Amino acid sequence: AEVTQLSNGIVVATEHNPSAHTASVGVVFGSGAANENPYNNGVSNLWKNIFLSKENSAVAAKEGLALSSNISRDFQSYIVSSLPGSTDKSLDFLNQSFIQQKANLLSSSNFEATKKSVLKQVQDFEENDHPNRVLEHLHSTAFQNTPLSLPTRGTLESLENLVVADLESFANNHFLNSNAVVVGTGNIKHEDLVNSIESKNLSLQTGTKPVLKKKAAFLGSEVRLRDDTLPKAWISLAVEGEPVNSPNYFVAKLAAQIFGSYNAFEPASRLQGIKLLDNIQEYQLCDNFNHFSLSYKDSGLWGFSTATRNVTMIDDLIHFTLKQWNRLTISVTDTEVERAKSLLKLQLGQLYESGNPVNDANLLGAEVLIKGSKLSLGEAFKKIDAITVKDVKAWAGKRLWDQDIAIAGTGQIEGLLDYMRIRSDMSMMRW
């Protein structure tokens, strides 16, 4: 029900949900913010904001379209959502203003205004968006001196020396046809889509993007940007997790769903099936925490990201959740496994099926770029319910028992004890 066909160049991937309204056609490239050097960084976000600029969006809005884009750590996407009877308009707009000539987009008035707005919103993100910036510093210190370490939005110091030559070089080096996947979600049928991509000739280039010299290797590290102006203490620690197209991927997502996510002020998240919430609820050790499991192309992370207003008992929160992490290897039960199985099925269903047909476009483009064909919601559910407690114990002994962690913090984090205690509290002496 998620059909994929390889044409002369590009790969077309689509899914036809005939009850949805807005059909959404776009192209998803396989060169995100980890396919460049740290000096031209932020050229992916700059390309996204060039595509989303006032000129391009007014041209798209006069015809009845609505642009979208999403830059991630290996795929970047350009989505033109539209009405269901109007997608040949979407296709030839995306041809005429992104795939062929872009001289209307890349002259030094629109590029100057776009670069100024990008500089303002990146520095506003760096000052006033605290949990995302420490997840970003966690990525920057986990995979350091190695191309997965890069900021997605780009840093300010490597964004004020970018001109149109950088964007044209990136569009020549990474906006290819053996690197691109065109996607269709919403209610377009498959064959009218490829009929309209093969009627009007649509091909970006012919070549191949440059392969990287250094693969993503985890380096157990530590960083702290302690700003004691801030009222909270945002820390986040994470180990090396399993990447995409790895056999231990769904057990990593299940082991994240075992500990779940929490919010101390909602009275329905204080009653979950976590054993950690009987330790962190008598002195109110944190405000929220969420156990992520990110899986990029070469490697990935596995850890929790919190926020703490009780900045004196930070080490107790760290120690309690790390003992709960060691409970995965030594004595995890089966009722936690089945609770996390049902909750992981619910979360993947809420992610894969939703009202917006551009998130499905981004997910379908990513997992057709890296894998080759999309596995359905049924096969994912079968691979989830085929997981026993011993597979979780084997994976937790593989990737969580005494492994190197990487910590990224900000705020009032002097109460955070320093590194060797946190590293050697990942392994207890069997109680």
Binding site: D228, I314, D315, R423
Partner: protein, 93 residues
């Protein structure tokens, strides 16, 4: 308990130091590092730097007091010989 008088050292989280902002601290786990990194370079060169900077303050007073002790000891060994008995009486009274 009784909150006693304030001192110049609190505990973790409120240590009583000045407020700091913008001091990033990078570190690397020792399992990723090599211990005994540069022990022969820092055993020959840095130890000589520390010995070069801090040996006059130790050797000038040691030299003064050792020369004083050696001169006094050999003067006493001179006096309780036979060639100093008139000097022994003269120093006595």
């Amino acid at each position: 308990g009784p909150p006693s008088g304030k001192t110049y050292m609190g505990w973790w989280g409120h240590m009583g130091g000045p407020k700091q902002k913008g001091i990033t601290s990078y570190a690397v786990s020792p399992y990723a590092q090599k211990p005994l990194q540069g022990i022969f370079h820092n055993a020959v060169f840095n130890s000589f730097r520390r010995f070069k900077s801090q040996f006059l303050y130790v050797l000038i007073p040691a030299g003064i007091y050792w020369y004083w002790w050696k001169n006094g000891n050999e003067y006493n060994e001179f006096l309780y010989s036979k060639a100093g008995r008139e000097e022994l009486e003269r120093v006595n009274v």
